[PDB]
Write a protein that binds this ligand. Structure first.
Ligand code: HEM
Ligand SMILES: C[C@]12CC[C@H](O)CC1=CC[C@@H]1[C@@H]2CC[C@]2(C)C(c3cccnc3)=CC[C@@H]12
Length: 460
């Protein structure tokens, strides 16, 4: 079993119509195969674009590849590799990941917290009846409150200016955080603001100052006899020790990861989903029929309705396939000498899963470039199915998403409540939203407007 050297690609030329980096590397697989590497100075990066090899990296050898590479921008955002998402493997990451996951067991109620913020969201949108608006902000408020309650048992009231403070440093960090090491090899894709690094520090300081103020004030509120939220879980763990792993700054960075991920991922997917529905009125009408028939207008949707709003479930699965939140996940790193397929991978090598490539494998999916929720239903439309093994929207293995349950609950309920109450149409001017996307740390959609109107079937 002597392993082979990885294919090494010496240069990455400009190629027309290749779009974003994840599609560019995907298309290069036709010439170099499903796994190949590039070198920058002393650092080697391997890109993996087939599900079998990806599952080896993520699952079968998940521990070998559970590291995270060091990057200047990621260092800034994670306060030098604290927190969860950008923390290297080891004792700090394992502890804070375990505690974050333990916190979600205290909400088994999650549906109730979410529905309360969605009702406020719908009330706010109904006030704009007849207008064409960007719904980013209202949705941002609802999911921000959900995660604030999970983290602190606090919620913001409509109009609180802190919501705008958070939205603006969120946008500022995301716009200046580059997680793609290879960008310098494909300079025509390196798109960042003028003074990127200082602007990133500027916005991160704002975030760190606000969270530290919350955490410091929370020391006065914490009691060991009531552990109901994430900061409680972290503070109790410090007391009950490990104690060096739970520094104030470690706790602050972990809270920051959850606070940011809990808002920017789900808000993005909601916007993507609505955009796809504006481009596919046929699907939208079938979603209205499904909800009117299985829920009606007597009551509001609940999580139990996931068993009967099957096309809605399929639509979300299809958005997560076609515009993945993380089309190249978060970069991995080999913690030890290891292997992928028949190839040797040295300790320290950066390993990137091209999830875009998995989600557009023409041999594992039928017409992968088009929005077809029905691929996740049987022919009758009566049961959800998994048509492909090349589908990993939340990752897998040791570094898999820890917010999946929350995300799926938020996405289902938000969409269901919105479809029950509102007609969602293209604006008066013809403008449809661009589906091209903006490949930042989250795969964002260009801002767009939607004509929203209370459905008159919802008259009473
Ligand atoms: C909304 C749809 C979401 C999708 C599709 C998604 C998917 C993903 C993916 C692909 C990764 C990277 C896996 C890897 O590096 O191998 C990830 C990591 C992560 N996600 Fe999500 N996520 C979503 C929402 C959320 C939410 C709502 C939260 C928290 C409330 C969250 C928290 C995290 C964290 C902390 C990590 C890093 C885990 C680690 O590095 O150990 N995500 N997620
Ligand atoms: C930058 C941002 C969002 C902007 C915040 O102000 C800072 C921040 C903290 C954590 C990051 C998050 C973006 C999404 C990240 C990167 C994320 C993530 C990414 C994709 C899927 N699930 C989670 C995990 C940690 C999250």
């Amino acid at each position: 079993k002597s392993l082979l050297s990885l294919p090494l690609v010496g240069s990455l030329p400009f190629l027309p119509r290749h779009g974003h980096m994840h599609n560019y590397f995907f298309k290069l697989q036709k010439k170099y195969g499903p796994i190949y590497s590039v070198r920058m100075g002393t650092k080697t990066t391997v890109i993996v674009g087939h599900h079998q090899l990806a599952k080896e990296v993520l699952i079968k050898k998940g521990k070998d590849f559970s590291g995270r590479p060091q990057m200047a921008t990621l260092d800034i955002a994670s306060n030098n590799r604290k927190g969860i998402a950008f923390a290297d493997s080891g004792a700090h990451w394992q502890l804070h990941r375990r505690l974050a996951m333990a916190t979600f067991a205290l909400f088994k109620k999650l549906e109730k917290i979410i529905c309360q913020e969605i009702s406020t969201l719908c009330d706010m949108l109904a006030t704009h009846n007849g207008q064409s608006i960007d719904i980013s902000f209202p949705v941002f408020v609802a999911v921000t409150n959900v995660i604030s309650l999970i983290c602190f048992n606090t919620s913001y009231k409509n109009g609180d200016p802190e919501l705008n403070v958070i939205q603006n440093y969120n946008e500022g960090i995301i716009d200046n955080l580059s997680k793609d090491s290879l960008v310098d090899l494909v300079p025509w894709l390196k798109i960042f603001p003028n003074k990127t690094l200082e602007k990133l520090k500027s916005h991160v300081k704002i975030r760190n100052d606000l969270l530290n103020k919350i955490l410091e004030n929370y020391k006065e509120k914490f009691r060991s006899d009531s552990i109901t939220n994430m900061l409680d879980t972290l503070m109790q763990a410090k007391m009950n020790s490990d104690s060096e792993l739970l520094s104030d700054n470690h706790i602050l960075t972990t809270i920051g990861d959850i606070f940011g991920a809990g808002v920017e991922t789900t808000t993005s997917v909601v916007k993507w989903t609505l955009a796809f529905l504006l481009h596919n009125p046929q699907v939208k009408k079938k979603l209205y029929e499904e909800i009117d028939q299985n829920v009606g207008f007597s009551r509001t949707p609940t999580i139990s309705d996931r068993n009967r709003l099957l096309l809605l479930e399929a639509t979300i699965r299809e958005v997560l396939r076609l515009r993945p939140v993380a089309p190249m996940l978060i970069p991995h790193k080999a913690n030890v000498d290891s292997s992928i397929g028949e190839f040797a991978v040295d300790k320290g090598t950066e390993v990137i899963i091209n999830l875009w490539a998995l989600h557009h494998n023409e041999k594992e999916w039928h017409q992968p470039d088009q929005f077809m929720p029905e691929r996740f239903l049987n022919p009758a439309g009566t049961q959800l199915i998994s048509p492909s093994v090349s589908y990993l929207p939340f990752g897998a293995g040791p570094r898999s998403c820890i917010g999946e349950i929350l995300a799926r609950q938020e996405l289902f309920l938000i969409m269901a409540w919105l479809l029950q109450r509102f007609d969602l149409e293209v604006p008066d001017d013809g403008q449809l939203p661009s589906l091209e996307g903006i490949p930042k740390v989250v795969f964002l959609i260009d801002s767009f407007k939607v004509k929203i109107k209370v459905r008159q079937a919802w008259r009473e």
